[PDB]
Design a protein around this ligand. Structure first.
Ligand code: LN7
Length: 272
């Protein structure tokens, strides 16, 4: 069942993030980001009842909170990535430990010519879309392709120093949340040509706000964490039409300053 999860790996942000985290804007309020990430953890863990493994902040790694970038997980198989940003590679160490406690099958992307961000991987439930970006390359998607054999993998040129999931993400089975920008619409279509099947599409006015979290919770159903009507009111209005979804607005303004979206701050795990 798509978007069904039992666990989630997250990680506390270090104080060094406000000043030291890679980006591309306002000064970051660390107190505010702190809070926001707390709320974010509670929605998944307290409100939604997933077992959360919280990793401790490594001050040394100001980007460490964005855990999605370091691992892709599908069924019982963990891909531990080789992040495009050289400096962020020391964040895999601590994630591999955790994914080992979860008794998950590990594969490490060690190939020295292979970069891959999890931020660049869209998993539709039916297949894989990997974005070819400034951080994820051919040699990485091929290894991602090689790790998840039961699934078809195809690559979508993502430009402009972004990621694939900066303008899209799954908002339900067969439903792909999508930005209006011509960048996104382009990849969107590029994506469909390549599928053995047609996806439904949820379009939203703000590229960033098409990054959301869909979940299939036991005795809850469709669940979507999405950006607030404050941050992105015209996109919130679009999510508001999803009347089969338990809609939980989740703010993420601070982290966005450093290119942090909703999906980046967790790795989701379905366990028997
Ligand atoms: C999430 N996945 C957003 C980009 C990919 C959709 N990752 C944010 C990472 C933010 C760090 N500061 C970085 O620059 O890697």
């Amino acid at each position: 069942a798509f978007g069904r999860a039992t666990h989630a790996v997250v990680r506390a942000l270090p104080e060094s993030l406000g000043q030291h985290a890679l980006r591309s804007g306002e000064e970051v309020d660390v107190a505010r980001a702190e809070r926001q990430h707390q709320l974010y953890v509670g929605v998944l863990g307290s409100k939604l009842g997933l077992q959360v493994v919280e990793l401790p902040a490594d001050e040394s790694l100001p980007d460490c909170v964005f855990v999605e970038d370091v691992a892709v997980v599908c069924e019982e198989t963990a891909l531990i990535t080789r992040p495009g940003a050289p400096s962020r590679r020391k964040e895999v160490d601590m994630m591999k430990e955790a994914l080992e406690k979860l008794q998950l099958n590990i594969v490490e992307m060690k190939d020295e010519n292979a970069t891959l961000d999890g931020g660049d991987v869209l998993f539709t439930g039916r297949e894989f879309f990997v974005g070819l970006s400034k951080r994820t390359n051919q040699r990485g998607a091929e290894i991602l392709a090689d790790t998840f054999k039961d699934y078809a993998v195809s690559t979508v040129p993502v430009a402009d120093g972004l990621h694939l999931k900066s303008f899209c993400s799954m908002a339900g089975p067969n439903l792909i949340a999508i930005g209006s920008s011509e960048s996104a619409q382009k990849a969107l279509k590029i994506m469909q040509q390549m599928s053995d099947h047609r996806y439904d599409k949820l379009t939203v006015p703000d590229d960033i706000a098409a990054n959301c979290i869909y979940l299939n919770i036991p005795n809850k159903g469709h669940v979507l964490l999405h950006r607030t009507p404050e941050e992105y009111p015209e996109s919130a209005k679009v999510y508001e039409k999803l009347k089969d979804h338990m809609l939980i607005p989740v703010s993420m303004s601070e982290l966005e300053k450093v290119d942090g979206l909703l999906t980046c701050c967790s790795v989701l795990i379905n366990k028997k």
